[PDB]
């Protein structure tokens, strides 16, 4: 067994560097600045993932600064960080040591879809609720993730615990300070991003979250396409042509362009006939052109679609307890504190 030691700083708690030892290193994925490793910490036996991110000498790394201040059961935990060399010669890389989670929402979704089966709705409810909580939490700091997609939703399939990860695009949005439009991944981008807006809000994450919900209900992405124009055609086929008033809420530079002229498809026909009507209702309040008309994450947690999760006797299909769903904090509740009446049921 090859043991490796490094000097590293705890992700949370005091800034005192400590000796960290790990072993059982093995490649588990590919990253944008080098491959991603798994390792086992010698002191606890816990598995971690180690991701390289490449340090800017001019700026503090934004992802590291965000990760150090987040503490939530549905967000991946930063255990340690340290600097090293790596792929490119002479380059210094930031290494983020994250708690390892073995699967993703995308893996589970593809497993059902390949089998031509639909994900059981109880899991759709559990996953989407946990994602909306993670989003309520980061949004309460003003932090927008900007790359919500199924592959960024870590999942422990045994316990049904979901954790949001990959904050490499996240940013604290400030009104009246522009943001690059080129973030968020194909299939999940809000139409104001497709239109190249620089003045969007955290509601781009809610659109992406609606895309994930629709995907879980359909067994395939709802707005596929390799170009923004192909993606927009799929959006227009569902929502219909945006009005000039809607376009001006998305990007007013686009109001006078020629768009495909298409009537909205009825929401009840977008999904299979036996899709639960509350899921369709929820989806229709997330996939809205007007960004301010989309539900907030906290409003989405309180939606009727999630009422089964507030039932005292709800259980996982495998017979286990559901994960923690009601340990809201003042921080997490701050966008609308008296939603706790729905959010925290009596037995909590």
């Amino acid at each position: 067994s090859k043991v490796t030691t490094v000097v590293a700083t705890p992700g949370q708690g005091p800034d005192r560097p400590q000796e960290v030892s790990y072993t059982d290193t093995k490649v588990i994925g590919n990253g944008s600045f080098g491959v991603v490793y798994q390792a086992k910490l010698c002191d606890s036996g816990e598995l971690v993932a180690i991701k390289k991110v490449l340090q800017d000498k001019r700026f503090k790394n934004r992802e590291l600064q965000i990760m150090r201040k987040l503490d939530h059961c549905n967000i991946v935990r930063l255990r340690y960080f340290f600097y090293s060399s790596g792929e490119k010669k002479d380059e210094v890389y930031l290494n983020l040591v994250l708690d390892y989670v073995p699967e993703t929402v995308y893996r589970v979704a593809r497993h059902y879809s390949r089998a031509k089966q639909t994900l059981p709705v109880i899991y759709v409810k559990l996953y989407m609720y946990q994602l909306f909580r993670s989003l309520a939490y980061i949004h309460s700091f003003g932090i927008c993730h900007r790359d919500i997609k199924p592959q960024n939703l870590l999942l422990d399939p045994d316990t049904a615990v979901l954790k949001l990860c990959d904050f490499g695009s996240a940013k604290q949005l400030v009104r009246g300070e522009p943001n690059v439009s080129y973030i968020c991944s194909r299939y999940y981008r809000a139409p104001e991003l497709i239109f190249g807006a620089t003045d969007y809000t955290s509601s781009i994450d809610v659109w992406s979250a609606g895309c994930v919900l629709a995907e879980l209900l359909l067994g395939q992405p709802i707005f596929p396409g390799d170009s923004g124009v192909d993606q927009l055609v799929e959006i227009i086929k569902v929502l219909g042509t945006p009005t000039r008033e809607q376009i001006r809420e998305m990007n007013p530079n686009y109001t006078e362009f020629k768009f495909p002229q298409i009537k909205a498809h009825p929401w009840t026909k977008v999904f299979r006939p036996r899709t639960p009507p509350e899921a369709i209702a929820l989806c229709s309040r997330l996939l809205e052109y007007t960004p301010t008309a989309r539900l907030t994450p906290l409003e989405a947690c309180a939606h009727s679609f999630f009422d089964e999760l507030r039932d005292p006797n709800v259980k996982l299909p495998n017979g286990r307890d559901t994960p923690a769903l009601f340990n809201f904090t003042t921080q997490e509740l701050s966008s609308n504190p008296p939603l706790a009446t729905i959010l925290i049921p009596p037995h909590a």
Partner: peptide, 11 residues
């Protein structure tokens, strides 16, 4: 496909 990890219990 577009998977995060190389390995999975579902493949």
């Amino acid at each position: 496909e577009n998977f995060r990890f190389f390995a999975s219990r579902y493949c």
